[PDB]
Symmetry: D2
Subunit: 370 residues, 4 copies
């Protein structure tokens, strides 16, 4: 009852995000090439390197990624999508996958399989009881990829591949995916839209990405009606809003649902220094969010909780946000956040009326979780 799994694969740091900023470089638009795309793998690699350099790695059980099979991927995705990803992976320089901001390098399907497979392998080992919990520091991310496409830097929906494995292979009847990446988990929402056996929750900045989704009225359909929960929050929301959302909506939803496994889509792009959103969460905020969620798992599903890396785009600060979560898993709290004092005076630590109201909009939906 205490052994914490940790997945990193070298190839997670070799994802080729190209020479553009977001979309590709384009001379006619006068978008100058740049060395580091916003989604460049160094951000997540720096998190891995801090896990090692901090000494946290000594308290973790390293777990090798095992490449996701076609069968694994097909539990979350269409055969057509999988076949299309094989095609672009073959291109001599890779290329965009569909949406104009989602570059796959040459041979990049290998990395996408290892990323989904890292989530699956950790899930397997936690669910069997070999491990009590873990963190899969994967790349590329997953939560934007719906059933039939790649989208928003995501090739396959890692957490959904892992949930599908938990359902079909491990025979779990109820799984929860809690996504706190600052962007709406539209892919995950899509995949399990009609399905009450995977409760999908997304805490995000309202309309940050994608532009047309993540409204509280998006609640699933058919037998899945009531088993998708969006918590859109306003720009500028910080630790107070995020913790109020955890206490009023997320944790009660999990307790109502009684999942046999909790998977956390753990992005750190809600951080105070992220370029790709406008939120004010600090490493201490993420710490408290993780502590609450792990304690919830202890109470309702024998501690079975798997964290899977989603987004986050500050190479400076993301490592300390991620380390705080790892420390809550290991219980070894051995390094300060060196930005703590600098960021703590910027605010986000008072629950504003507009933040409170956004969260309260979701509370009446809890009663529909049977």
């Amino acid at each position: 009852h205490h052994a914490i799994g940790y997945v990193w694969n070298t190839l997670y740091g070799w994802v080729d995000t190209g020479t553009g900023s977001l979309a590709a470089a384009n001379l006619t638009a006068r978008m100058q090439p740049i060395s580091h795309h916003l989604a460049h793998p160094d951000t997540k690699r720096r998190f891995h390197e801090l896990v090692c350099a901090s000494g946290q790695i000594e308290h973790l059980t390293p777990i090798a990624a095992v490449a996701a099979t076609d069968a694994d991927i097909l539990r979350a995705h269409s055969a057509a999508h999988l076949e299309n990803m094989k095609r672009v992976s073959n291109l001599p320089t890779g290329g965009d996958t569909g949406d104009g901001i989602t570059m796959m390098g040459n041979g990049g399907l290998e990395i996408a399989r290892l990323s989904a497979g890292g989530a699956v392998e950790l899930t397997r080992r936690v669910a069997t009881g070999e491990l009590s919990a873990g963190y899969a520091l994967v790349n590329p991310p997953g939560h934007h990829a719906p059933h039939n496409a790649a989208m928003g830097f995501c090739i396959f929906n890692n957490t959904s591949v892992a949930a599908g494995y938990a359902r079909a292979v491990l025979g779990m009847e109820r799984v929860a995916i809690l996504d706190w990446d600052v962007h709406h988990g539209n892919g995950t929402q899509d995949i399990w839209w009609n399905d009450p056996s995977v409760l999908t929750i997304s805490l995000h900045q309202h309309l940050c990405f994608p532009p047309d989704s993540g409204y509280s009225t998006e609640r699933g359909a058919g037998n899945g009606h009531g088993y998708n929960i969006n918590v859109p929050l306003p720009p500028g929301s910080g630790n107070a809003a995020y913790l109020h959302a955890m206490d009023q909506v997320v944790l009660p939803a999990l307790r109502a649902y009684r999942p046999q496994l909790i998977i956390v889509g753990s992005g750190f792009d809600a951080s105070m220094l992220d370029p790709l959103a406008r939120m004010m969460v600090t490493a201490d905020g993420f710490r408290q969010m993780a502590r609450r969620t792990i304690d919830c798992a202890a109470d309702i599903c024998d501690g079975r909780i798997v964290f899977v890396q989603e987004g986050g785009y500050s190479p400076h600060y993301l490592p300390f946000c991620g380390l705080a979560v790892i420390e809550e898993l290991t219980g070894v709290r051995s390094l300060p956040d060196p930005y703590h004092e600098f960021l703590a005076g910027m605010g986000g630590n008072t629950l504003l009326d507009a933040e409170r109201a956004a969260i309260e909009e979701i509370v009446p939906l809890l009663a529909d979780i049977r």
Copy 2:
């Protein structure tokens, strides 16, 4: 009555911001070295290169920076501060100047003089009527440096050196400094605190940086009481809030004061993609802010307006925010913002109640501007 000055010096791109993220790299804190400090000069250089590549440079009059003299600097700063900057500039690898986030490279005083001097030289040429207006794309920035210190990446207060020159050398009785960098212009506020001959205005994110300043109650002292105006805005404020602040506070303040010259501390760190603040301004927002301010100058001080670069930390997006301002100066609107559609759906375009109220707090202070 139409000739637009433009200052860039190669050395503005050679500022040595070190190997840290914000503070220096530190092994005991496990702050890993990184190639690009948040304040790395490539951000501003990319703006310069876009000015050239877009063809805007063909509509601009290039103006060489002339190094600020000791006498120039002393109109804004103490002799002790100037002498201290000579000392750290001599260090073999340079070093921090005081506050732990303000690195000067070896020989870096040369660049700091050229940065202040770029502001002065443009000011001189606009004020004499050789030029109608201009943009000084300087680096290092200025607005955090108070009378007796360097602070927040700023060695000398460029806009205050330029205002002091306009006062003492050109004999102007009234100058305005309008700072729309997202961080509080505490340095500028300090320098002219007791002085009604330089009206200092700062539109900023409340308590973003520095942590203890920029409150609406900071209004100057003695004869300068009423001649400093802070407009702190909440995190998440976008184009609607910024334009409401321009229309309700900034432009009326300028009209009340009747400056003979307007200097704009033109930062783009309020942009939607900036890591160092939480605001939602787009290039079209900055465009409208610039258009309004230039038109105000046409109405009240014969078009005499000088823009001087302050902060901004998105190498991806800052160039397009800066280009929009340049286009409003030249009147040649020849390149789209390629991020426009991507960013426009994220919000910030509706004036929220909390934003409106923050701005309305400053309106009663307009009556004290004589």
Copy 3:
């Protein structure tokens, strides 16, 4: 008698997209990890430009705007098929490799290739008219590997050949010389003017460095052009002594024999002591002396009409000082030391070795065939 030195830099020369590979593209199956800076990344040449400015040399130069090379300009050196193929790759959403697997063109990159060739043309025009006495076109992408019908070795169009073709067809010059001291064989230039005695083509290079199968002393042109191509392959490790002996024994005598009306220098700095893409030992003082000699030769034989056009060089650290030395020889304002001078001076290359002397002496009997 006149002194005005032209200088071409265009912002877009620094925006060339060399991709995320090292040399070829990144490739996961081969386990070639992506990297930020390709060997040929534009920062190397941009750092040279920035040093020209920061050193104060720019104050002694006459800035000359690049004018995009027209289709007609390009067709004086290249086939219509090559030009049309470059339009195709330039249109791709992320650009792509042109023919040879190491020559990436970015999206819209044809614009930069036209400005690069056009920079060489515009400087050539203004020197030839006498507006300028001489100049330096700090262009990018480079040119000398591109033959008539292809892109090759980071080169889209052969800038110096476009400029020579302009000097021939538009300015009516009967004799032009292209002296290429890039460390790699100027195979493109050799190819373009192979049959043509009106452009004397000379290449000083490391033997078999790049391309693998060319630059032998036996490659001398054909037909009426026989004798009007001169290769000077030198052994790896050759330094200042060898390069200067080659200038004195072969290059300068060749130019004097030929009596060009204009000298175009393919000015690469990849023969430098710190270059990753060759094994030569030339220092900034070596390049200085090479430039001084060539400029003085131009003064003697073609009224000072000399145009330098940037080719290769891959040390972002040291190339700027090698380039600055050449600029200083043009302006006559020698105001900055090479800060690497003492560090590099003890490594050698300053004695003419027997193998180096012999390699150079192989070319001397060919001088008599230059009529």
Copy 4:
């Protein structure tokens, strides 16, 4: 008879702060522009580590944790004054240059220097006991330029000498050999063991590349150590043929004459064809053959006890493949091609030139003095 190959990598080896200069610090008066990647930046060696993992070689290796070198460990190779001076610079808020103007230590960087020396020690311990048959310590910062009383040439402590001193004093070995094939002269190692015949020190290097005044064949040790230091200076442009001739004629016979109980290899890859900091032409296949020969020699004379310790190498592009070749010779699993092989193979270096042969033959008469 046993086969288990140790491998040392520590995350902090990739965190060495080489600063914002190219070689020396950035300097505005000299107009040396700041740059992101110093020549010695840790990404080069990290890319080697990442390729070891991504290639699947890591699956055939036994990972061995670095253990920080103690003061006592360091003092077997260095003075107390040097150790104390390194504590001082490590304490500086942004670190700083150590003695020589090109050797930057970051803030807290002594921690990494201890882990680097300690990685060499720990691998040496585990090979010597027979737990492991051999191994590779991919350490950083490097060691071989650091003499007894100073840091020099990117080196804080002399890792291989700390390891040899441990093998002598703690493991009681009477004879150890250090074979340094970094392209720069191992002057530090030479200095440390100058008077001492119990550590045979051999350096194959480019003549006068770095440092400027050392590595001559006449530098042979002193007193009881006379004859127990062997320098093999080679000319610029030397490639696989020269390096292998040096191995066969000098290095391997020296080791056989000496009968070390342990062989430590100072394994640099800065002799590679693409290195900016030297002018040699060795390819990954060259390094492969050098490693195979040395490992086979160890098998014959000291029960296979061979420890490789990373020294220099400055091509982030190519070093990983040179290093991988050596790892493959240790594991016997030859599963990835050198993707540069065909590109580099035609550049030369594969014929033994007369000057190269003569440089090597100068050392052969010194073999008889190794008793």
